[PDB]
Amino acid sequence: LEDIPLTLIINKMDRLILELKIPPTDAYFKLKHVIEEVNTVIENTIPGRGESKRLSPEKGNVLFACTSMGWCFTLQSFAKMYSESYGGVNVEEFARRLWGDVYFNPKKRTFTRKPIEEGAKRSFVNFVMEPIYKLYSHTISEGPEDLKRTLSKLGIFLKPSQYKADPKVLMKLVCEQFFGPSTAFVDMVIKHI
Amino acid sequence: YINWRMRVTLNDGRQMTGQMLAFDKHMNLVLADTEEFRKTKRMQAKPNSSTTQTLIQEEKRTLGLTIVRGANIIALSVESPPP
Amino acid sequence: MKLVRFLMKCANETVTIELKNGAIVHGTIASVTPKMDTALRNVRYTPKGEEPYSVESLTVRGNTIRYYILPDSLPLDTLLIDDAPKP
Amino acid sequence: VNPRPFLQDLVNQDVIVRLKWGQTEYKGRLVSIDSYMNIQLANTEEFINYKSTGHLGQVLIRCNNVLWVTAAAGKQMTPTE
């Protein structure tokens, strides 16, 4: 009503992974429900122009965060992680095809509205939500040497004392090495505010 | 060698002078409080002397911070230790 | 095998280097990079038809190095032997 | 035809190699070539400005010196008017 521009921060994704313990597809549905509820309040306040003020991850004004573990990402920043790892992806197009009811058919390398196989994964699930689940699960579940092997595959390195550290401090350290600082938040605010 | 004073000579014959800050693998030179030297050899022909003394005027100008393209540096001469 | 690494381990001499556009530099080598950017100490330097300059140190980029002249007392054979591990 | 198989076709065949400087060209029975365009030439003869400057022998030409390379199947080096 005061016409202040609005960006969204979906917090406590560790509560998605560790409290509710729902699978990554249901985590996607939970996130979609929360974002659509915010947009529903927007529309019910300004009818006919809430779509002009629409909040959605593919636009880049939604930031997924866990503040107890000090990480945040947008879809654009997560596609930028993919760009810096595997080299040469078009980040904006990848993020656009990361959110939504789209699916990644692997051997065709295609993004389709329907899966090519019964039970194929969504783009967001397959490329964002399952990697975060596996980061958490292998960080808290594996021993120090197995954990060193997995994080060394990803390029994440810690001191061995930090490897044997407590699960919560270890999880925060691995999240710092994975996600990095709040550049996603800074990009979102610069772009949309 | 970081934070020393440098004089850098560039391929047409210019000189960029002052306090350097950093570098890279491409040896791109960032350098601060810069003043630039052009060695323009001017033919200051005196009206009384027939010998055209081609005097190498080293004109100077202050600019600030430089970012020298790494495919352009020829020579780098160290001048003074850091303060 | 890298002649760049060969020059690394036969560096540190008062050598004579002709520049890319026609200057001459001469002194004692400090080090040579993998990108061939050598560094010279106790340098004296003659530009194109101008007065020479004698300076303490001078680094030269590898592409700007056109021509290279070693001193005549170099142990060529035992500095041309190979020591790199075979992959 | 692709340029690389064209180059192995020119291998063991007389070629005309014109450089990018001074209108230099070479008559030459090519011997072999590598993957990064370095011409191994034999029976090398050199023209400046389409005049006879002379035979040299068997030479090596780098990538960076070449302007173009063609075959020598009945091609004349007099300047056409």
Add this chain to the structure above:
Amino acid sequence: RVLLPPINFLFRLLQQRTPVQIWLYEQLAIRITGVIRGFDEFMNLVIDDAVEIKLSPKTNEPESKRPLGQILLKGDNISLIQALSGSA
């Protein structure tokens, strides 16, 4: 809208066999007119029935022509590619 890559442009001019005018870098007086035969990753254009043209140094008109057969033209030497639209 259709976004067309330069390599796809090279492939379609190859398959349509259009005449090609090639300008060389820092050589405003030397051009090559020919028929395309193929390319590679370094876009070295093998050219068919090519004629080199030395232009006039003042009026920029074609002064001297010289056919040279089938020529490998180097990719970095190639500067500008122009698909000459034939009158059909």
Add this chain to the structure above:
Amino acid sequence: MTSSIGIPIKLLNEAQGHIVTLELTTGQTYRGKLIEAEDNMNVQLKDITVTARDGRVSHLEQIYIRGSHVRFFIVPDMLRNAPMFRSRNV
């Protein structure tokens, strides 16, 4: 190996948005607001004051400049005082 970026390149990235003055291999000095600079030092500018070595003074908008054909750049003292010059020991 993981590719790091050079300090002058990231200084250009931090200089995006300010009034930079650069000059180019044809001896041409351009002034204006930089809007994007990439790792190969390709830049754009938007409020360009042009001084070309033939004595040509002009002014226009939205030019693209190649990093191979650029000679150097000039940026302010706050960009001297930028945080990346504080070497964070890791």
Add this chain to the structure above:
Amino acid sequence: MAPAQPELKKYLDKRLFVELNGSRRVIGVLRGYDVFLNIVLDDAVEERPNGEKVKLGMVTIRGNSVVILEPLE
């Protein structure tokens, strides 16, 4: 690491001037480009320093020859 694709998305299908080394001026409209920024121009008109405009067609220029881009509108 792979070279970055140039930020020429604003220049697609755009009425624009190109400056090439040797002061060769090429007035063109984009249709597409590559990571080597090989500028492909349709209905191109080129220009020499004496001030003469000729029609070239749907053409391309090698990115290393490409120097300066200036849009008009």
Add this chain to the structure above:
Amino acid sequence: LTVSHEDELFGKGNIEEPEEEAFVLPAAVEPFFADEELETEDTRSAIELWWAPY
């Protein structure tokens, strides 16, 4: 939604991205873990001890 995100990405009822753009990832691109399976044998007890008291 006057225009949907999937509808803007594909078009009404295509059920396929149109071939004129047809964005495809490079072959090297894979999800960040991919070969590690979602859940270790000890992940149940890891979460249970996450919620255990001091």
Add this chain to the structure above:
Amino acid sequence: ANGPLSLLQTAVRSHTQVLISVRSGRKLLARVKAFDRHCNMILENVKEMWTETPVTNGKKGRPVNKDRFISKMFLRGDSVVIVLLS
């Protein structure tokens, strides 16, 4: 190993002279010791000659085939116009 590498290796083995024209418009007569994948050259008994026109008192003079002798020499692969194995 079947082309330019073969010529350079044959020059290395035979220790025979090469005549090299180089991009400074210069001419070289020297022996061959070693080469690399970049074809950088290490040289001995080097005789370097070039064409220089002395500008005597503002007038163009006749050219000089000015030459010098260098004992040991190193050469870069991109500076070559042509090498001839004499």
